[PDB]
Amino acid sequence: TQQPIVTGTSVISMKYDNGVIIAADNLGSYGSLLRFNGVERLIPVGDNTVVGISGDISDMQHIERLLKDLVTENAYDNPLADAEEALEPSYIFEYLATVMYQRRSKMNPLWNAIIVAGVQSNGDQFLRYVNLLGVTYSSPTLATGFGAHMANPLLRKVVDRESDIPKTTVQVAEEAIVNAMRVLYYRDARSSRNFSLAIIDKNTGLTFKKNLQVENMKWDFAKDIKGYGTQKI
Template sequence: MDSIIGVKYNGGVVIAADSNNARSILVYQHNLDKISQIAPNAILGLSGPNADLVSFSEYISKNLKLYSLSNPGQDLSTKAIASFCRNTLAVALRKGPYQVQTLLGGWDVSPSTEDGEGSMYFLDYMGSLQKVNYGIQGYASNFALSVLDREWREGLTKEEAIKIIDNCINVLDTRFLISQPTFTIKSASKDGVKVEREVVAKYGVERNN
């Protein structure tokens, strides 16, 4: 029942995730962070059982840290991180699958633009990988994917990308049967990873950082 929403903009990516930690008919908490910083300029939004969310995100982040320590000054690109995540999921599929659906977003230095560029990848637990400009994991796609189809365009600013995320959250708040009252929004850009805001959708309240 998790909702992960991602939008690429000119110079980075924005990913939002609901903060519910639930199982069956019971909600344990409304402040679970489902967006992990796995590299200095990369974030991973995860949907799935809490145990798999934690184990998969920690496995990826620790291995990326090990790589950076073993190869100083040679940080992996977002594409390389996506390939490593895909391989990890594919290998686990034949052993003990990670039941996670993910959106990976990151920022990389680009020779064509001074500010670099963002990129986003859609991965599922079967090991499928696709580069996308926007994406949604979870039942939220039934309601909010049309919003992304209509409103995304090339050259978005961060503010415009966050506005699209807000519109998606508003649609879920109105139409989705499952209550997801809190969302966390994070961005990855040349300035690193930043928590943009926490949205209490049910009451229309925003807590800006």
């Protein structure tokens, strides 16, 4: 049993007609001190999977190391490591899921909330969640922490049920995701303006975008607001 120290906030994601999108800002908080600013919380595994991690950063780095090994190991005595026997998103997930639950079962959790985003070899989209309790679930949209409260409501307005997926495009989806990131920057006190976004499309493959920024921010109305009730000036 432990307690998180350096932490990463929300990880949001959804699936559209051709793939999945996932994003996470680049902040590593230390309590209310916005300490680190170049933290990449999106871990690509191969070219069909991206693992988004929130929670304890030291634990995330550990999980990051476990993933590099998965790759190295899957390569051993595997002539089809980059073909039929390459790591599938489902394999990577089932693995992390296994670990997360074994660890909570030993009363020594990996203090994270994880979302595995990817496209299976048969083109199927993959999006599942697993946290420190070893709890797992899928849904057209998935977000951790704050994103669960603020991002999901927005993203679900785009893909409310399974059937809405084939009707959603990378443009519509990426747009939703980016607006969500702006909202989170507005109301989450543990968020950064800078973030990374990744797309895993069954055609264009994996597109990883770094150093994005929340733009188009409404603040002007703040000038017309003075006092907290009766104050006029």
